[PDB]
Amino acid sequence: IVGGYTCGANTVPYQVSLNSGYHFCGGSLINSQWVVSAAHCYKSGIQVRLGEDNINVVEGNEQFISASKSIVHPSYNSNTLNNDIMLIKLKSAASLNSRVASISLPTSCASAGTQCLISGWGNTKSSGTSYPDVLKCLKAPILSDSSCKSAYPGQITSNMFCAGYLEGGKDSCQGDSGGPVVCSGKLQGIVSWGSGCAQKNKPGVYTKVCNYVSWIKQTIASN
């Protein structure tokens, strides 16, 4: 996250870190046995780390649970990033408390102008690199689809929205991939892609989770 603030330990209790020997992507706990993330984060051998603040220090609230099954959206296109969403089932159910909690799925799509919380352990610099050990947070609005399509000509599908600042300076970034965009207590987006980070007129692009609620529900009912 570029231009954000330190969230505070366990103040984003649905935030997960996906680990394959190191943190490589964020994700969101949607019930005690399922995580949603970005399909471009797919990897074999994923361990899900819950209750994390410092990802390099064991602090007492962590739950490390291995994935038993991963399901990439049946129409994911890695070239255009359309349908960049994946579900991960945990080997055993997470123990839920104030610090490890699931986030609700939306029953409505959120509108442009809605303020949201984006969070992750990704890069904090627009030019150059520096990865935080503790979770970072950013409040950003959803942008109109016409300014989103004007920023990314011929690249935005109906399964994507832009959120952030056309002025730049504040944005998600590499390593924040797969992580949550929560608006009014509901998961509305998944950190997906963009042109670099915190650049002028290149806001973040997010998977539109409200389009996928019935694929998610029927997939977790059957697996």
Ligand X SMILES: [NH3+]Cc1ccc(F)cc1
Return residues touching Ca ion (CB under 5 A): 52, 54, 59
Interaction of residue 197 with ligand X, rule CB under 6 A: yes
d(CA 222, CA 33): 13
53 belongs to the catalytic site = no
- Out of 63, 183, 194, 207, point to the residue binding ligand X (CB under 6 A): 194
CB of 174 to ligand X, least distance (A): 4
What DSSP state is assigned to residue 171? B
3-state secondary structure of 2: strand
Report yes or no: 39 and 83 within 8 Å, Cβ to Cβ: yes
Q: How many residues interact with ligand X (rule CB under 6 A)?
A: 11
Tell whether 172 is in a known binding site.
yes
With 0-12 CB in 10 A as exposed, 13-18 as middle and 19+ as buried, what is 92? exposed
Q: How far is the CB of 50 from ligand X (least distance, A)?
A: 22
**Is 59 marked within a binding site?**
no
Q: How far is the CB of 137 from ligand X (least distance, A)?
A: 15
* Catalytic residue status for 177: yes
Q: Which residues have a C–N gap over 2.5 Å right after them in the chain?
A: none
Instruction: State how far the alpha carbon of 167 is from the alpha carbons of 82, 138, 170, 199, 202, in Å.
Output: 25, 15, 9, 8, 9
Site string for ligand X, 82-121 (x = CB under 6 A): ----------------------------------------
Identity (one letter) of the amino acid at 61?
N
Q: Is 52 annotated as a binding residue?
A: yes
Strand segments, DSSP code E, in 32-77 are 34-37, 47-50, 63-72
- Marked catalytic residue, from 73, 84, 119, 176: 84
Question: 40, 53, 73, 119: which one is catalytic?
Answer: 40
Q: Is 174 in the site for ligand X (CB under 6 A)?
A: yes
Q: What are the catalytic residues?
A: 40, 84, 177
The binding site for ligand X (CB under 6 A) comprises 171-174, 176-177, 191, 193-194, 197, 204
